[PDB]
Amino acid sequence: EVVGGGDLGPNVLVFDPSTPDIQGKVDEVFRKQESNQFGTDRYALMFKPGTYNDINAQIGFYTSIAGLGLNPDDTTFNGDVTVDAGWFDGNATQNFWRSAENLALNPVNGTNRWAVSQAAPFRRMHVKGGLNLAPDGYGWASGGYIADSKIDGEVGPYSQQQWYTRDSSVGGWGNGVWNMTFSGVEGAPAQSFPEPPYTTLETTPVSREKPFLYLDGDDYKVFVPAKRTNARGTSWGNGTPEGESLPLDQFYVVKPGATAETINAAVDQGLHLLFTPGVYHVDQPIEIDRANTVALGLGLATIIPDNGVTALKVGDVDGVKVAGLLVDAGPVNSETLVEVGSDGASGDHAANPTSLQDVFVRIGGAGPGKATTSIVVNSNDTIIDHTWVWRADHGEGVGWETNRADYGVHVKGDNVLATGLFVEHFNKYDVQWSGENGKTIFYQNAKAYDAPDQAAIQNGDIKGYAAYKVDDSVTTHEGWGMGSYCYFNVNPDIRQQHGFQAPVKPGVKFHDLLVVSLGGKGQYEHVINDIGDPTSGDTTIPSQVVSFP
Numbered sequence: 001e002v003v004g005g006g007d008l009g010p011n012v013l014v015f016d017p018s019t020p021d022i023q024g025k026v027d028e029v030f031r032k033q034e035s036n037q038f039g040t041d042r043y044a045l046m047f048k049p050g051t052y053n054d055i056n057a058q059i060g061f062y063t064s065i066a067g068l069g070l071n072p073d074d075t076t077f078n079g080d081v082t083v084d085a086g087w088f089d090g091n092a093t094q095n096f097w098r099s100a101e102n103l104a105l106n107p108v109n110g111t112n113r114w115a116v117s118q119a120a121p122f123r124r125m126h127v128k129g130g131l132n133l134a135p136d137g138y139g140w141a142s143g144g145y146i147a148d149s150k151i152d153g154e155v156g157p158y159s160q161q162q163w164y165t166r167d168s169s170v171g172g173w174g175n176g177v178w179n180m181t182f183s184g185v186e187g188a189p190a191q192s193f194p195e196p197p198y199t200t201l202e203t204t205p206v207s208r209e210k211p212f213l214y215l216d217g218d219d220y221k222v223f224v225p226a227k228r229t230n231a232r233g234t235s236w237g238n239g240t241p242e243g244e245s246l247p248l249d250q251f252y253v254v255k256p257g258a259t260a261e262t263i264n265a266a267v268d269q270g271l272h273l274l275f276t277p278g279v280y281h282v283d284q285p286i287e288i289d290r291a292n293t294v295a296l297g298l299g300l301a302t303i304i305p306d307n308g309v310t311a312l313k314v315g316d317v318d319g320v321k322v323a324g325l326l327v328d329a330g331p332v333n334s335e336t337l338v339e340v341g342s343d344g345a346s347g348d349h350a351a352n353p354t355s356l357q358d359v360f361v362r363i364g365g366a367g368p369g370k371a372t373t374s375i376v377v378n379s380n381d382t383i384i385d386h387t388w389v390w391r392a393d394h395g396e397g398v399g400w401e402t403n404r405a406d407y408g409v410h411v412k413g414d415n416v417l418a419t420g421l422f423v424e425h426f427n428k429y430d431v432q433w434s435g436e437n438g439k440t441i442f443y444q445n446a447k448a449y450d451a452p453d454q455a456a457i458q459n460g461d462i463k464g465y466a467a468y469k470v471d472d473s474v475t476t477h478e479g480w481g482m483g484s485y486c487y488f489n490v491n492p493d494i495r496q497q498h499g500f501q502a503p504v505k506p507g508v509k510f511h512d513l514l515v516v517s518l519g520g521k522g523q524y525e526h527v528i529n530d531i532g533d534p535t536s537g538d539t540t541i542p543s544q545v546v547s548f549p
């Protein structure tokens with residue numbers, strides 16, 4: 001019954017080099033979105049292949065910008081794609097929920113500025129010059145994620161606390177602050193943690209680039225990159241990238257008003273899903289139980305589960321590619337928000353794994369929201385490549401009970417890989433890992449700010465809940481470049497026993513861990529288990545562990 005293909009709707013702005021007043025049109029979107037942190041507006045800016053002059057595309061909230069060529073250099077800006085922090089007086093720590101992909105930039109002063117914090121991916125980009133990751137003035141910033149990109153010149157983080165870069169090429173790298181992690185990055189600075197705090201891996205164990213919309217002549221298609229094992233450098237540097245092109249008419253083009261029943265029928269009938277920019281309320285889980293289904297969002301397309309249901313369930317199948325979606329909790333508590341596979345799923349998916357990419361979760365902030373566990377990863381071999389799972393610390397509908405969310409991510413499957421894992425503020429364990437042979441490359445956590453007192457976070461005989469917990473029964477696990485920060489501003493007398501908790505076993509290893517008290521608001525007692533120095537002072541100096549056990 002469901003028809004594939006069709007128009008992308010009014011929230012997808014499509015430009016070509018002859019479009020009149022491109023600058024004016026992009027500036028109009030930016031004026032609307034610049035400080036629109038919790039609004040319901042959503043935009044995707046899409047540029048047809050060609051050359052664009054005299055352009056400074058300033059990117060505000062819920063705005064994605066992208067080229068429509070097969071390769072990044074097919075769509076070239078003589079100009080910039082800019083994120084700065086003017087709206088927040090130079091503070092970039094609320095620069096969320098936006099993206100840039102599949103463009104070449106020739107920045108007007110030789111350096112492009114992408115001064116972002118969480119959920120602001122920078123993918124498949126070619127910067128013909130430098131890349132500045134800091135706001136003008138070098139104020140606060142908490143990014144960040146770069147993948148499959150080539151930066152001809154230097155990447156300069158300056159004040160950025162931490163950063164993850166994978167499968168990329170850089171001309172240089174200026175500095176590190178607390179945790180700069182690299183995997184498969186040509187030109188990455190050599191491993192040197194703690195000083196500078198560089199965690200450097202030669203290759204990424206497995207990666208698969210995010211699917212993207214492009215134009216084949218006048219036909220819209222979605223390119224679906226093939227996976228790489230031991231990846232290094234860009235996927236597109238040497239011409240033809242391997243992968244499949246899916247015609248747009250093989251996608252159900254989701255637009256506001258669609259029901260989960262219609263969406264589920266579309267997948268059942270063999271269509272992929274393309275979520276146009278908008279906010280979608282569902283009264284039952286979106287269910288993806290067909291192998292190789294692509295579920296791709298544009299313009300920070302958002303799914304809100306009503307009536308306490310789960311927003312998204314992926315079945316026990318190979319090859320599902322979920323990308324570019326925000327899942328936003330409803331005020332009625334959901335048991336789970338996102339489930340990948342069923343409870344106890346024990347089949348493998350090694351050759352053709354399911355992946356979540358640029359999948360973001362929010363609980364509270366745009367009104368009250370609640371969920372018990374945000375993402376449960378049951379399926380073996382699943383790849384989590386850039387996620388921000390965030391219990392809101394500011395906005396509307398926020399409070400220790402008002403937007404309670406006990407658990408962020410729970411990984412139960414085996415051989416799960418997380419690259420670029422950002423999880424913050426949950427009332428209990430931000431991340432728990434129960435499956436075997438888990439790997440995490442880069443972790444950023446901040447603990448809940450609003451714990452009212454010590455008793456409220458007592459975890460048996462432990463003060464507080466680990467930001468990252470590996471179950472005692474696990475035999476094999478490995479993490480690289482991982483940090484947990486605390487800011488107990490409701491009760492600064494609080495003590496957090498550790499950032500990390502894990503069994504002491506030969507096969508369970510950690511590299512480059514740190515915990516940080518932000519301005520002395522609470523302190524850590526240790527880094528992992530009861531190992532590592534406590535934090536002290538109010539000077540925000542990290543306490544570090546290079547190797548564990």
Ligand SMILES: OC[C@H]1O[C@@H](O[C@@H]2[C@@H](O)[C@H](O[C@@H]3[C@@H](O)[C@H](O[C@@H]4[C@@H](O)[C@H](O)O[C@H](CO)[C@H]4O)O[C@H](CO)[C@H]3O)O[C@H](CO)[C@H]2O)[C@H](O)[C@@H](O)[C@@H]1O
Nearest residue numbers: 093094139140141142158159161393424446487518519540
């Ligand atoms: O705004 C809401 C969001 O808050 C996010 O966490 C912020 C956290 O980012 C902030 O940290 C700052 C650090 O950024 C700052 O780093 C210094 C660098 O800027 C400077 O260049 O170098 C020095 C070291 O040489 C760094 O210390 O340092 C200050 C303390 O001096 C930290 O406070 O702290 C905020 C609380 O004050 C905290 O809210 C959070 O991740 C988001 O989830 C949240 O929505």
